[PDB]
């Protein structure tokens with residue numbers, strides 16, 4: 538059985554719109570979403586469908602771009618670093634579950650390099 542997906546709404550947490558959070562949605566998330574390599578990362582890993590019974594035994598902090606998109610839309614992050622951490626979790630999860638040189642790993646590495654290039658242009662705090 539898959540776990541419930543990550544929470545994406547926190548109605549009691551204060552909310553703010555900032556230049557950095559807007560950029561993370563409209564530039565960073567949007568660019569990664571549209572990359573040819575994005576599809577495996579756009580929704581939670583369906584370990585039942587993929588027949589990966591060990592996935593959620595190994596990966597205890599799952600994260601995906603669909604969740605990150607919803608969190609940005611719902612103002613779930615107060616600080617830009619919370620969102621960056623989620624992207625980093627998604628990439629490292631791929632490296633943890635898989636092995637160096639696997640196709641999925643090479644795909645995540647390319648997405649991570651593009652991510653870091655976009656974060657290099659994050660608007661000033």
Ligand SMILES: Cc1cnc(Nc2ccc(C3CCN(C)CC3)c(F)c2)nc1Nc1ccc2c(c1)N(S(=O)(=O)C(C)(C)C)CC2
Pocket residue numbers: 576577578582587630631634635640641
């Ligand atoms: C976020 C993430 C992290 N880690 C993995 N690992 C992983 C390991 C083994 C297998 C199966 C797959 C290979 N055969 C078929 C038997 C063993 C696997 F499906 C995934 N998947 C992920 N997502 C993800 C989602 C959907 C799909 C994916 C991947 N693929 S895919 O094969 O990776 C690709 C993209 C075509 C290269 C198929 C569709």
